[PDB]
């Protein structure tokens, strides 16, 4: 698997023998926010 | 100026000091059609 990153455009590409397999975006996170991982309000508070 | 090509995705990128400048797709013309360059049917011959 060959991986290429275009840092300026925050893009990446993965190829297998010249055939595209995965494509998208990737970039480092400047200011992580721990509250992002707080568990979301469940539909049922106390199912018990 | 540095030019990076993603051959699999047929995309390129031009950057200067880590800042994006140009972006788009560039690929070879497999079977050129000479008639694409014919002058398009015009409304007036413009003889005079």
From Swiss-Prot, chains A, B:
Post-translational modification remark: In adipocytes, S-nitrosylation of Fatty acid synthase occurs under physiological conditions and gradually increases during adipogenesis.
Expression by tissue: Ubiquitous. Prominent expression in brain, lung, liver and mammary gland.
UniProt subcellular location: Cytoplasm; Melanosome
Miscellaneous field: The relatively low beta-ketoacyl synthase activity may be attributable to the low 4'-phosphopantetheine content of the protein.
Subunit structure: Homodimer which is arranged in a head to tail fashion. Interacts with CEACAM1; this interaction is insulin and phosphorylation-dependent; reduces fatty-acid synthase activity.
Role of this protein: Fatty acid synthetase is a multifunctional enzyme that catalyzes the de novo biosynthesis of long-chain saturated fatty acids starting from acetyl-CoA and malonyl-CoA in the presence of NADPH. This multifunctional protein contains 7 catalytic activities and a site for the binding of the prosthetic group 4'-phosphopantetheine of the acyl carrier protein ([ACP]) domain.
Protein name per UniProt: Fatty acid synthase
Organism: Homo sapiens
Annotated gene: FASN
Section covered of the full-length record: 933 to 980 of 2511
């Amino acid at each position: 698997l060959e991986v290429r990153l275009l840092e300026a455009s925050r893009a990446f590409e993965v190829s297998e023998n010249g055939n595209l397999v995965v494509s998208g975006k990737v970039y480092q996170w400047d200011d992580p926010d721990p509250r992002l991982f707080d568990h979301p309000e469940s539909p049922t508070p106390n199912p018990t």
